[PDB]
Design a protein around this nucleic acid. Structure first.
Ligand SMILES: [Zn+2]
Ligand SMILES: [Zn+2]
Lengths: 163, 365, 365, 163
DNA sequence: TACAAAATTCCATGACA
DNA sequence: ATTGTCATGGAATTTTGTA
DNA sequence: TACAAAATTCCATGACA
DNA sequence: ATTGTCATGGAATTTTGTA
């Protein structure tokens, strides 16, 4: 009803498996519905557990009202269901096979995979150390609509590392 | 030699006439209200003052009272003070009786990520193998990141801040001169990312006051949750972090989180005042909030304060003073006055030290 | 139930009319200047306050600001304060913001040997096998005896005071509650000689202030003599003792020795003013000096002091507080007020403790 | 020339040898010329050394202007002579064989030996522990002349242990 | 009945636990 | 059941030598 | 245009090193 | 080269509901 805001919705997805870096295989991807801000967490499995351990990190900063995801076994589990009921997060699922996000999220989530591939090649074994440099680049990347970096929309100032 | 003229009744500058100056035992004597006192010759007087002083290395008044038992001469104290100024031992041992001038209240950083303050708490009781908490406070917002570590080591500080700067990169990180941050490995990590390192004067936690103060609250809350229970603090850090970042400062009337993000997340009792504004209206209402924040001014100077003049003689407090050894270093010159509370001294002897006046005393005399 | 009448526009004591009270989602709501807030029913309100408080156990104002986001009702703070008073955890953890009233300046003992103050310094660097110094100050004169010991033990205290009381026997010996003096062996040694033992409230060195202050000077002089040299303090004690007993207090204008004996011995710069008086004239001039001595009065109370009322709720500081555990004990009742700075409490739970107010805080709320 | 005072003169003498108590054999005796106050120190020998060690204890309280003694080998030594020149004490010696004190000191020094004997008998092995009780009794003992205890003349008040 | 400087007193500051 | 203390050295105040 | 009480602000006090 | 901070809960002050 009212205008879209940060923390209204968090779109989550798993990327992988990738060539093992530092004993990790997967990247959990969390994009903010409204701003396009992106968190990335390396996991060892697309398991409920790995998701919860990861999302405990994120929810020490901020808790979303809604998490949107596909019907992946990890997110459909009742452990994950209970986790989110505790923190008072509403869970929301896309249809099987027809996985829909925001127009802006689809755009963003595509950017990530391509950016990951470009920088995987050449150093496929060493992608772990790069996740911060990646995360930083995405969030300070100019959006064709609004011409605001996700950073700017989240914090309401300019960053000290532009691109 | 000069005391010849006196006995005869000829005037000498500083020797009040009306008292009769006589001779006994081949010493010059004088009848004074207080009693009859020996007047020693000029050359003997330094020797005397020193002997009196050295009995127990007493100050001006104490040292005089001894001397005045036997002797009299003109401007006695002047001579006493002269010695107390040259007593190597009293200088480096006696405490101060002058307090440092009123503290400064440095302007709050303008934007979030302008300045980070960092510090380690601990050691604590071992929880899950961890002993220390790295604490990181954004200067502007007072937002705080907590990271459990096994050592207050550069190594672990770097690991922890790599996760942190995935969110954003600060301009300035301010820390104390603890080994973990003064290492050359840290300087490089910092240089790579274009972060300026900035250090408190040595042994002055007040300069890291923002973190230090936050250290307090972290500990006080952990304490409250741990009553009854055994001290399992590892699992609690996140809750504490979150709890603290979302607590109002009654003075600001805002939570750190609010100052950082400009809206409440999905936490309990989340504020809804700006629910009708577009993100955009909200984001400028925020810029308005951030510049209007309460800023404290410096308090009045106490009656007996001092302030550093260029060229003043000055002494630095011995850092970790051994049992029974002087609590102060030898005298030092002030070189530049960086501000009314911070000073560059030519030291021991001699390098440039930058020090807080709280670790300084004015060499007296 | 009571919120039925309200929606209809009928008045209720505490619910300001002029604001329209409406219904949505089956919750009662109100339009207020600040915004539109949910008014919870009576029974729900304690539950709410508690949840808000428990986020990070915040005080009055912080806890309210959370609640006031979503809710409104009459006299909100009254309810908040009610909880903060019953929070076991905040009570025993939060610090005080009220300082104890102004200190007392107990009258100087009348005669020498009326009262002895005693304490151990140390441990020090081993000198000749000795580690501690027993320090004994006569209350009236400030005369001081020093005895080197290997332990702060009853055993050694007795050995040392046996030599001391060969000179004279005190009426009263005042000490801290350190194990060496609270032993039953010491009580007996003391009883035999007809000496009353008297103890400071626990963990309050200010009560032993006369010795403690003399501890300082002993150490400061030892320090000055030991500069350059290795810390051979054993041979120095006598010289220190003598040096100190014969030093003027600029306020009294007398040395402890003088107050004790009424003439200077054969020391350097020995005072000769009473050389013509018979011992007898001298001895009464002394009695005159001893009663005329400067006596300090108590200072003004600070703006925000407190004083102990009988029946007041009160909390004793945890003595050796473990890492991360509350800095205060549970609440206690004041039983008698022995003086404005000393109190008997019914404790934990419950014995009679006699404590200084400096180790006390008023339970708030 | 001027009236007699405390610390003007200290009369010293050795008593012994006595039956061994606590490994001690001798008592050094110091009486104040003017007041009659008495210090007692147990020594192991009537040696210069034992005297100096003992008198170092006394001179942390007060230093006399003069010490008077007989021509005992211990006091005629040049070590003792140097000791006293340091502290600025004048040494004064009685004639050999004709040992003179003050009228009052002779009286007092006699009291000591008799008091020592009365309390030696019965417990000759245990006189060390008693030296304080002895010292105390002497100094708070009423003088036929002045009717002042030595204590009173030294301190100018009354003691808390009268006799 | 008055002055400048010395001599004395005042007293905040800090350290002992 | 018991309780703060006091050296120190600039500053503030009072006394002093001389008129 | 004025009141009593509530609501809000003030701010000394203490603890983080 | 750099620099004190701020929760807390009585008290003091200002605002509020009603007249
Ligand atoms: Zn000195
Ligand atoms: Zn609480």
């Amino acid at each position: 009803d009212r205008p879209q805001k940060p923390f209204d919705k968090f779109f989550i997805d798993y990327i992988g498996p990738l060539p093992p870096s530092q004993g990790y295989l997967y990247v959990l991807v969390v994009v903010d519905g409204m701003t396009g801000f992106t968190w990335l967490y390396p996991t060892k499995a697309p398991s409920t557990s790995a998701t919860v351990k990861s999302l405990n990190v994120l929810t020490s900063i901020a808790i979303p009202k809604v998490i949107h995801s596909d019907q992946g076994a990890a997110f459909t589990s009742s452990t994950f269901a209970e986790w989110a009921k505790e923190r008072g997060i509403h869970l929301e699922f896309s249809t099987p096979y027809h996985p829909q996000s925001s127009g802006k999220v689809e755009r963003k989530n595509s950017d990530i995979k391509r950016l990951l591939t470009k920088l995987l090649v050449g150093r496929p074994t060493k992608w772990y150390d790069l996740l911060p440099v990646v995360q930083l680049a995405l969030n300070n990347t100019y959006s064709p609509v609004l011409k605001y970096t996700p950073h700017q929309l989240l914090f309401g100032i300019d960053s000290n590392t532009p691109f | 030699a000069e005391l010849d003229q006196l006995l005869q009744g000829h005037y000498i500058k500083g020797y009040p006439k009306q008292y009769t100056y006589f001779l006994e035992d081949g010493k010059v004597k004088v009848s004074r209200p207080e009693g009859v006192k020996i007047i020693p010759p000029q050359s003997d007087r330094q020797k005397i003052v020193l002997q009196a002083h050295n009995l127990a290395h007493t100050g001006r008044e104490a040292t005089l009272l001894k001397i005045a038992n036997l002797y009299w001469w003109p401007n006695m104290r002047k001579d006493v003070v002269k010695q107390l100024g040259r007593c190597q031992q009293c200088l480096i041992t006696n405490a101060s009786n002058k307090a440092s001038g009123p503290i400064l209240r440095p302007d709050r950083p303008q934007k979030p990520f302008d300045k980070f303050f960092i510090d380690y708490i601990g050691p604590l009781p071992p929880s899950q193998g961890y002993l220390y908490v790295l604490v990181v406070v954004d200067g502007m917002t007072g937002f705080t990141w907590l990271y459990p570590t096994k050592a207050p080591s550069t190594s672990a500080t770097v690991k922890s801040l790599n996760v942190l700067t995935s969110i954003a990169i600060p301009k300035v990180i301010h820390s104390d001169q603890g080994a973990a941050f003064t290492s050359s490995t840290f300087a490089e990590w910092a240089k790579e990312r274009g972060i300026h390192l900035e250090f408190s004067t040595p042994y002055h936690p007040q300069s890291s006051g923002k973190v230090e103060r936050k250290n307090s609250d972290i500990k006080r809350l952990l304490t409250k949750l741990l009553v009854g229970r055994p001290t399992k603090w590892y699992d609690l850090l996140p809750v504490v972090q979150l709890a603290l970042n979302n607590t109002y400062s009654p003075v600001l009337k805002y939570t750190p989180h609010q100052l950082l993000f400009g809206i409440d997340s999905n936490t309990p009792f989340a504020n809804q005042d700006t629910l009708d504004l577009t993100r955009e209206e909200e984001l400028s209402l925020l810029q308005e909030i951030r510049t209007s924040l309460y800023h404290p001014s410096t308090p009045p100077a106490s009656s007996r304060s001092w302030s550093p003049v260029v060229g003043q003689l000055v002494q630095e407090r011995v850092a970790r003073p051994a049992s029974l050894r002087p609590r102060w270093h030898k005298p030092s010159t002030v070189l530049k006055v960086l501000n009314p509370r911070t000073v560059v001294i030519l030291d021991h002897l001699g390098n440039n030290r930058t020090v807080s006046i709280d670790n300084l005393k004015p060499t007296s005399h």
